[PDB]
Prior knowledge:
This is part of a larger assembly, with 2 copies of chain A.
Chain A: E1 37-41, H1 59-62, H2 76-85, E2 90-94, E3 101-108, E4 114-119, E5 130-136, E6 146-153, E7 163-171, E8 177-186, H3 201-208, E9 212-216, H4 247-259, H5 275-288, E10 292-295, H6 302-311, E11 322-325, E12 329-332, E13 339-340, H7 345-356, E14 383-384, H8 393-398, E15 404-406, E16 412-414, H9 431-450, H10 455-476, E17 493-498, E18 506-511
Parallel strand pairs in A: 1-2, 10-11
Antiparallel strand pairs in A: 3-4, 3-5, 5-9, 6-7, 7-8, 12-13, 12-14, 15-16, 17-18
Helix pairs in contact in A: 2-7, 4-5, 9-10
Amino acid sequence: SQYSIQQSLGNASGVAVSPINADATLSTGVALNSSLWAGIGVFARGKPFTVLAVTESNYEDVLGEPLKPSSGSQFEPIRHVYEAIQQTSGYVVRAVPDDAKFPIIMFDESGEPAYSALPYGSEIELDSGEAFAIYVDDGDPCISPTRELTIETATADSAGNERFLLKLTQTTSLGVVTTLETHTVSLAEEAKDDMGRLCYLPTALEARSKYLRAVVNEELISTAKVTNKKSLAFTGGTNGDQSKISTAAYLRAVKVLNNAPYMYTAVLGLGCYDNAAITALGKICADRLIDGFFDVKPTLTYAEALPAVEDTGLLGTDYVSCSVYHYPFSCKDKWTQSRVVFGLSGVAYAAKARGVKKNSDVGGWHYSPAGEERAVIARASIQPLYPEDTPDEEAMVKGRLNKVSVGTSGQMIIDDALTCCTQDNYLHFQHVPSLMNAISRFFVQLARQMKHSPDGITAAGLTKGMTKLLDRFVASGALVAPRDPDADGTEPYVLKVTQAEFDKWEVVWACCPTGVARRIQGVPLLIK
Amino acid sequence: DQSKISTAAYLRAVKVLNNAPYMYTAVLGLGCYDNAAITALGKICADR
């Protein structure tokens, strides 16, 4: 019609405006100064084999209350999570034993309920007389506190379908009874609630409720009717024995964590001392170009610590960014007030996060996770496990094992930044791989955004983006002038974007990383 | 019954709005949660 604006204007009278170009102002949003930690573990409450999300204000309820050290070896990951959350949120994966079962309540045409329990990861087959089944997907075995489900009759909708109110409430062993969630659902395939949302039972429970799930029987759903049932009771749920877990469960959990569609920059090995799982997490590091902080069993003597590092499998050249720790000390627990021992992965990641939060523009990735201002260990009544033994500093450094010490003022600190790389070059320090991986991740983002463009745009865009990013790093202070300014020039970074064939755009950037200050030597002199 | 309306009616209404001989600088999607209608209104934006 009129007031319309064309864009082509080919060989005919008229006026047209071309669409806005906006190609010389292409930025990239990656937000490099952000770090999240991902880990697997064994907990009390949570959905098994499904990626979770833990923040500083919900971990207690999403992951359940902390376990008890006297129960067994399952008390480690909760403490690791508590020590690592202090800085940033993260993602966890809960792995359960084989015989863990969740409760199920199955109804019928008349409405008389029946109870059962089914192992995790299995769907439900409905009997002939069963109309619909409701089960709990929070992961809690519904043993303490108990959980009760109530059905109440409600007013029918405008169309005429009957909608009933579902109320699930938790009751503690002491006697405290509080409501937990409520809904208005119906068995009709098209009925709607008062607010207009869909009220069909399966989809409604799946979408708007994070505690329950339901299934229905298509044949019997037409004639199904529900009565008024008050104060039902889930039963049969059982978390099983969590002391022992087959390596298959850990492998499945780490595979799920691999396939998780999220972003994280640390693969913390939360209290999982299994060689296969540690190797898989190292593979995750190598694949995603991130950092890992694993730790050997913190109950081995200094003599057996060295062969265990070779055993755990990351010693080689593929995993150049994974650090291995060892903390053979005792401590007094924060919650249960007992004598417990656990690892150092959480504190190592806390040190790394404190380092990465220093710079604000691009984030400081060049700070090593050690020292007395960024890696202090906060515990209670640290009592050494083997006071009669002594470290093996030279052997530890040759075997790539970071060691704890006592810094100034008497608080224990981490005093090494050595990775699992065996080659004796710049790559075995901790900060260099992290900085290079940050650059590589930014490059991947930029090139993915800029793929499939003509060479004229591509060359200029790539050069501009890389020059800007590396200038930001140099201004931050992570790159310095080369050590020998005679052969390899005098610039911190050298960038070269070239074409190899019709489409092989090749970018080569060489950077000079900063030098950590690990060994300091003073030589006093006297002047005649 | 104004509860349910076929997408044909919404398409006809948005076509009439497109062909309207007036001047406006905002194409507010007043409480119409239909994918086809929203796409048509986006077309109106991109055109005018």
